[PDB]
A paper describes a structure:
Contrasting with Enterobacteria, members of the dominant genus Bacteroides often encode several BtuB vitamin B12 outer membrane transporters together with a conserved array of surface-exposed B12-binding lipoproteins. Here we show that the BtuB transporters from Bacteroides thetaiotaomicron form stable, pedal bin-like complexes with surface-exposed BtuG lipoprotein lids, which bind B12 with high affinities. Closing of the BtuG lid following B12 capture causes destabilisation of the bound B12 by a conserved BtuB extracellular loop, causing translocation of the vitamin to BtuB and subsequent transport. We propose that TonB-dependent, lipoprotein-assisted small molecule uptake is a general feature of Bacteroides spp. that is important for the success of this genus in colonising the human gut.
The structure of the complex (BtuB2G2) was solved to 3.7 Å resolution by X-ray crystallography. The structure shows a typical TBDT fold for BtuB2 with an N-Terminal plug domain (pfam Domain PF07715) occluding a 22-stranded-β-barrel (pfam Domain PF00593). There is no electron density for the TonB box, suggesting that the N-terminal region is disordered despite the absence of ligand. BtuG2 is located on top of the barrel, forming an extracellular lid with a large buried interface area of 3463 Å. The linker between Cys32 and the beta propeller runs parallel to extracellular loop 2 (EL2; Ser202-Tyr239) from BtuB2 and is constrained by the BtuB2 barrel via 4 hydrogen bonds provided by EL2 and EL11 (EL: extracellular loop). The BtuG2-BtuB2 interface is stabilised by ~40 hydrogen bonds that are evenly distributed across the interface, and 6 salt bridges. Gratifyingly, based on the BtuG2-CNCbl structure, the B12 binding site of BtuG2 faces BtuB2. However, the BtuG2 lid caps BtuB2, and the BtuG2 binding site is solvent excluded and clearly inaccessible to any B12. Moreover, despite the presence of 1.5 molar equivalents of CNCbl during crystallisation, no ligand is present in the crystallised complex. Indeed, BtuB2 loop EL8 is occupying the B12 binding pocket region and would clash with the ligand.
Residue numbers in the entry:
A (entry chain D): 32 to 366
B (entry chain C): 45 to 327, 331 to 491, 494 to 682
């Protein structure tokens, strides 16, 4: 007198501008979900992947990028990346075989990179054929502590930050698919972005206390893309746990979460004394900026055990809306 | 009827713990008691949780030893076979203290005893079935008027590729240029679920004419279990590799001098666990996460009960464990090009000393006070007291009421503090204020029946709970303050409705809420006054059986209410766990020979072929069977 449930195959055509929210869920709980928020109606729909496909998304969705009307969702602990239609949410394809996929960066319609953690290789795939095509061997990296995270492209080169137990940025030549250069910076850079001045901002987390690798004050770095040299370093206070640095549509104001939500012009010579949003007893975990109107969405995971909520604030800091999403939102994707 | 003054403990029947050879040990608790057991597979991570209580407050005792390895304060119950236990009580709540402290939920009190069989009684049981599952057990015993010995050994192996219609993940039918055509729920096999387990226990015992008993038992286990790919794991089983080895030993020596009023005993033991975890992939293999962590522990214990006549009884006891850990989780390349490790290595003493006074003025009224002092590491825990009362309401039907109040403390574990990838070594001890009250009932030899109920209520102060950070790893924090009351009921009857028509029955039912009562964490905290996740509101379990001469049959059933996979307890399509109704049944026929006793039995699990879920994302097998053949003296 008990059963399992399958089905609930819903179908719906959704708006043009929207915001996707990936929900990590709990490790080995396969409760990761995808949410979709409509800024024009202030209505959010949760678990859209399961409702549209009839089966669970997987276990640890990490991030999402959209290329040509198709959204690629990386599911870290499911060894797969799902390609879905950005309008119906129905699965259009998938690529399995990944060690622990992190982020995906497209080079062309037939070539894309997928960074990984717990691997010294960056998986190369062919989005058009939905299969794994190659590997990028990272120097001075083993499987036990290998780590590649975000990627940004600069001409024929691609820069990638090495986060977990690493302290470098790699320079990859996309014409040969091999690592051709590296740069050592603070310990564990968490993210990598490119601004309108061909500058690269990255923020390190300073490791952790008692680490055999290192423990330091995390920092924000400005590195010239052309010369691949560090030009600016803004150190914060030891003990801080900032998030990955992110930029807005015009790429001239960088935002991040430290203990508050900060914002800074990329040309400034010091970190501002005033924050964008004063702390308000909310567990800031995720952050993003609307590339078209500048509205800032802050994702608070709450206790990491129940559905999280996202606050939508205007560029001036006016509360515009708030809505419950999934469990532990940590990444966003604008449509 | 003393030392159980106001004490609530569940005693297990002789054949309740020797029903089937493998049967784990969680499968005995989960069908003759009414506590919660987080469990998915056979060779699974079966954890026991008491009334609204975390498993971290359910600590166990084997022959007086603490088996919960202090690297993480609990005991895995799939690592204990049903046939490797002779005596097993289960002290509930506030009654756990007068044997050892630190048990906020309560204690499982285990001990092996000499079977007291004279001669050579080799006993072999062999069992097959289900998904290529094979189990073997053998016991060689030696009996003597003064010496005694017994050697037991269990080996069980299975691939666990059970067929499941996977309603959790779909598979596609493609065409030219990888345009998706079809999608179906596959009928897959449990990937990387195999297991190979071996146990061996050697015990000897000494007895002289006057009351001087000696005893010694050593226990080796070698476990090699494959971590099942979770249901949404889109990875090849032959590509990936997820292995858990655990080689551990537990040994105990005992000396007991008992005479009339005064009974005294001392014990000394040692455990040593070595846990190896491996997670690898193919490029010709290579390790993704490869770790080895070993802890060894020395024991010292002394208990004594001086009971001057009746109406006064006094117990005293001491248990000191010195632990010695060696953790090592990853090998990293340090900045200097060298090779370094992230594991820590620590160790601390764990002393608990207790004194109790049982006083019964008359047969009706009786009370008792137990008082414990605990000291783990370098810190003296504040006195952990408890007080029991029992009373004979009416001699007709023995209706007896008991009640007891206490204040327990639990120290954080060595992973709770010194975990180097994690952190926060300044954690506060968990505080629990608890108090119970209940009643019991019995009526009698050509017929018999008994039962009782109780009442649970506990406030837990700042208690440990691990939280993710923005850095990708967990750290603990004493944030929540839970409020877990409840109630438990039991009833066992047996009326011989004929010359030989024995009908043995018992059943239990528990209402166990564990509502959160902490600081609302965020302005959107929906879990402020909701029950904690994975804590079933209602639980129940009935086991009944009957005998017709050499033929016997028992049926077991249990129900757990909806297990909330979310702290807020709201409904969610992706994370819904339905109520859990497991039904299983076993039957045996034996037939005695000259100097031997042959038996054949068959057991089923998951009758009705219900396709269900007990832990989120972890599949469960269909209907399964095992058939056993046994020779006994």
């Amino acid at each position: 007198c008990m059963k399992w449930d399958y089905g609930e195959m819903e179908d719906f055509s959704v708006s043009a501008s929207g915001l996707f929210i990936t929900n990590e869920g709990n490790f080995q709980y396969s409760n990761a979900t995808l949410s979709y928020y409509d800024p024009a109606t202030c209505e959010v729909e949760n678990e859209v992947f399961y409702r549209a496909n009839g089966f669970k998304l997987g276990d640890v969705a990490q991030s999402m990028v959209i290329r040509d009307g198709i959204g690629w969702i990386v599911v870290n602990n499911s060894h797969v990346i799902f390609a879905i239609d950005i309008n119906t949410f129905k699965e259009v394809g998938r690529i399995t075989g990944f060690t622990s996929p992190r982020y995906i960066h497209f080079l062309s319609d037939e070539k894309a990179y997928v960074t990984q953690i717990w691997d010294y290789r960056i998986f190369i795939i062919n989005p058009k054929t939905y299969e794994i095509t190659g590997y990028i061997e990272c120097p001075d990296m083993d499987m036990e502590s290998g780590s590649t995270e975000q990627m940004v492209q600069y001409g024929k080169y691609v820069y990638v930050n090495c986060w977990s137990y690493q302290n470098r940025i790699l320079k990859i030549d996309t014409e040969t698919d091999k690592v051709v250069d590296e740069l050592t910076i603070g310990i564990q850079p968490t993210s990598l972005v490119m601004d309108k001045y061909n500058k690269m901002w990255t923020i390190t987390d300073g490791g952790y206390e008692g680490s055999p690798y290192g423990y330091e004050a995390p920092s924000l770095y400005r590195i010239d893309a052309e010369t691949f040299t560090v030009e600016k370093q803004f150190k914060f206070k030891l003990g801080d746990w900032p998030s990955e640095v992110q930029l807005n549509g015009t790429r001239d104001t960088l935002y991040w979460i430290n203990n508050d939500i900060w914002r800074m012009p990329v040309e400034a010579d010091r970190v501002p004394v005033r924050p964008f949003l004063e702390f308000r007893d909310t567990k800031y975990y995720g952050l993003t900026v609307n590339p078209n109107n500048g509205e800032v969405y802050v994702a608070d995971a709450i206790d990491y055990q129940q559905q999280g909520i996202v606050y939508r604030y205007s560029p001036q800091g006016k509360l515009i809306d708030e809505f419950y999403v999934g469990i532990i939102p940590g990444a966003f994707c604008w449509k | 009827p003393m030392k159980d003054i106001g004490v609530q403990r569940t005693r297990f029947d002789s054949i309740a713990m020797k029903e089937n050879i493998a049967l784990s040990m969680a499968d005995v608790l989960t069908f003759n008691s009414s506590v919660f057991v987080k469990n998915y597979g056979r060779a699974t991570l079966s954890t026991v949780a008491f009334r609204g209580t975390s498993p971290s407050h359910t600590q166990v005792t084997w022959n007086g030893m603490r088996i919960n390895n202090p690297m993480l304060g609990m005991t895995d119950f799939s690592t204990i076979p049903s046939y490797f236990i002779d005596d097993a009580s289960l002290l509930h709540g506030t009654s756990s203290v007068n044997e050892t402290g630190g048990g906020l939920g309560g204690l499982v009190r285990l001990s092996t005893s000499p079977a007291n069989h004279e001669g050579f009684g080799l006993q072999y049981v062999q069992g097959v079935g289900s998904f290529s599952t094979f189990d073997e057990f053998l016991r060689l015993t030696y009996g003597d008027k003064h010496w005694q010995s017994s050697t037991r050994v269990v080996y069980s192996s299975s691939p666990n590729d059970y067929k499941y219609r996977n309603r959790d993940k779909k598979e596609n039918i493609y065409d030219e240029d990888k345009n998706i055509i079809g999608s179906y729920y596959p009928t897959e096999r449990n990937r990387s679920g195999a297991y190979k387990d071996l146990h061996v226990l050697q015990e000897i015992y000494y007895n002289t004419g006057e009351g001087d008993k000696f005893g010694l038992n050593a226990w080796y286990i070698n476990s090699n279990r494959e971590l099942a790919m979770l249901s949404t794991d889109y990875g090849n089983d032959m590509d990936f590799e997820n292995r858990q080895r655990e080689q551990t030993f537990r040994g105990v020596l005992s000396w007991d001098r008992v005479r009339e009023k005064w009974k005294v005993g001392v014990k000394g033991g040692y455990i040593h666990t070595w846990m190896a975890y491996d997670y690898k992939r193919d490029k010709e293999m290579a390790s993704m996460t490869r770790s080895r962590s070993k802890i060894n522990t020395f024991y010292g214990s002394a208990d004594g009960d001086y009971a001057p006549s009746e109406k006064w009884l006094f117990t005293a006891g001491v248990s000191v464990h010195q632990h010695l850990v060696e953790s090592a989780d990853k090998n990293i390349i340090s900045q200097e090009g060298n090779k370094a490790v992230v594991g820590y290595d620590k160790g601390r003493v764990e002393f608990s000393g207790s004194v109790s006074a049982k006083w019964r003025p008359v047969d009706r009224f009786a009370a008792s006070l137990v008082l414990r002092e605990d000291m783990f590491g370098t810190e003296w825990a504040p006195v952990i007291p408890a007080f029991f009362i029992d009373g004979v309401l009416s001699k007709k039907g023995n209706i007896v009421a008991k009640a007891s109040i206490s204040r327990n403390y639990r120290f954080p574990t060595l992973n709770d503090l010194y975990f180097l990838p994690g952190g926060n070594p300044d954690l506060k001890s968990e505080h629990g204020f608890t108090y119970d009250v209940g009643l019991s009932f019995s009526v009698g030899n050509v017929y018999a029946l008994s039962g009782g109920i109780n009442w649970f209520d506990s406030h837990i102060d700042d208690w440990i709970i691990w939280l993710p950070t923005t850095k990708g790893f967990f750290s603990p924090r004493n944030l929540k303050k839970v409020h877990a009351y409840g109630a438990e009921t039991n009833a066992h009857l047996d009326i011989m409705l004929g010359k030989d028509w024995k009908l043995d029955m018992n059943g239990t039912f528990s209402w166990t809420p564990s509502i959160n009562e902490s600081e609302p964490m965020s302005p959107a905290d929906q879990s402020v006054g909701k029950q904690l996740p994975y804590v079933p509101e209602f639980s129940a379990t009935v086991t009944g059986r009957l005998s017709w001469r050499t033929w016997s049959l028992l049926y077991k059933w249990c129900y757990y209410s909806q297990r909330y996979t979310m702290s807020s307890n709201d409904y969610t399509l992706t994370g819904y766990l339905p109520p859990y109704f497991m039904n299983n049944v076993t039957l045996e026929k034996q037939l005695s020979f000259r100097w031997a006793d042959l038996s054949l039995k068959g057991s089923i699990n998951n009758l009705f072929d219900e396709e269900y879920l007990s832990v989120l994302s972890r599949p469960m097998p269909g209907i399964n069977f095992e058939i056993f053949i046994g020779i006994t003296p």
